[PDB]
Design an enzyme around this catalytic site. Structure first.
Site, PDB file in Angstrom:
ATOM      1  N   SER A   9       0.836  -1.201   0.000  1.00 34.79           N
ATOM      2  CA  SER A   9       0.000   0.000   0.000  1.00 34.79           C
ATOM      3  C   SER A   9       0.872   1.254   0.000  1.00 34.79           C
ATOM      4  O   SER A   9       1.852   1.324   0.755  1.00 34.79           O
ATOM      5  CB  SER A   9      -0.956   0.011   1.199  1.00 34.79           C
ATOM      6  N   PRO A  10       0.566   2.242  -0.834  1.00 34.94           N
ATOM      7  CA  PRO A  10       1.359   3.469  -0.859  1.00 34.94           C
ATOM      8  C   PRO A  10       1.435   4.140   0.503  1.00 34.94           C
ATOM      9  O   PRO A  10       2.519   4.603   0.885  1.00 34.94           O
ATOM     10  CB  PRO A  10       0.627   4.344  -1.891  1.00 34.94           C
TER      11      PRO A  10
END
Lengths: 205, 205
Positions: A9-10
């Protein structure tokens, strides 16, 4: 400090890059199988009850990646530049962090999460929203080395967690000449960029 | 300090309430007719090139209401409580400000702006997203006098700018017993709440 994350996930990578930029050690915990069947109540009580990423800093629980980032910068940052104490410069970092969340990250998620997760049909309207967010980012970077001031800041680290993901997913950034310039110059400046960001990009690429 | 606003928008009222809470005078400027035909280039160059609200603080231009709010609190706040210097308490205010923007305000806008602006068909899915955001807010307020700490903070002022708008639009908050409790106790504590918030609510009500 415990760091509950999903490596892809960023927002998790944004926090990881921030800790690396600040020379902060964290104990990484993977919450992949946290929703699997038959995990003991004792395992589920340690599971973060809100969103990932979450830190546990000697009992202080904090979710929301951008709040984690500014907490880490002030609590553990040796110098100013990543999140300046100067109130005007700080306000611009804060402003860009909100832009990152509501335009850049939101547009990224709106287009790719139906595809990647649900194997859904590409939404052409959602795809153009990425371009709209990048056009704004490109305007912020006109005549600038960094997204939110004269030095690299938390806003660079948060934005790069999504922009690097776009490029890993073969979104062409070339027309955004300032975004392409910034992304090329920022990667070598980000401490441990490869270890903490490119590693997690593999699932997308 | 110049304050470019549309009196109806919750973000503008959030900033106005913050200035009132800090005893800050601002010169209110209305940007209603800013998109009308034949406004002089000289009038359009003073027009904020980004989003409303915007402040101009002796030449320092700042958009993004929540960045304005935390700037005003630190630059002009006499004491701590509205935006505590303590890094853990500050992180929770910051966290709640992001929640306010991406869950509460976004859900409000997604449902009511198609209706109010475009006279469009009610979206039942979008309507339930308001309830989902309020359920989270209600959980934050369980056992608490305020949304983001032991005193009223900027997060109370930002959230109330939207919650008060929901109630003006006849959204029933009663099932959210903590949101209803908090909204009733918070209005009398907010300096100049009537002047700076209820005035702008009239267009919706």
């Amino acid at each position: 400090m415990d760091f509950y994350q999903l490596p892809g996930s960023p927002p998790c990578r944004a926090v990881a890059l921030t800790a690396a930029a600040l020379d902060i050690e964290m104990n990484f915990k993977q919450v992949n199988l946290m929703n699997g069947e038959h995990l003991k109540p004792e395992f589920l009580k340690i599971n973060p009850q809100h969103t990932i990423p979450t830190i546990d800093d000697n009992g202080f629980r904090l979710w929301e990646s951008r709040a984690i980032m500014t907490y880490l910068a002030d609590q553990y940052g040796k110098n100013d530049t990543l999140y300046p104490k100067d109130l005007k410069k700080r306000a611009i970092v804060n402003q860009r962090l909100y832009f990152d969340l509501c335009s850049l990250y939101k547009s990224f998620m709106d287009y790719y999460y139906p595809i990647i997760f649900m194997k859904a049909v590409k939404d052409q309207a959602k795809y153009e929203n990425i371009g709209t967010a990048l056009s704004f980012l490109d305007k912020f970077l006109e005549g600038e080395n960094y997204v939110a001031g004269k030095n690299m800041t938390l806003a660079d680290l948060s934005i790069v967690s999504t922009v690097s993901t776009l490029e890993a997913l073969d979104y062409d950034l070339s027309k955004y000449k300032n975004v392409t310039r910034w992304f090329a110059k920022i990667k070598p400046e980000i401490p441990k960029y490869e270890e903490y960001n490119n590693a997690g990009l593999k699932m997308f690429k």
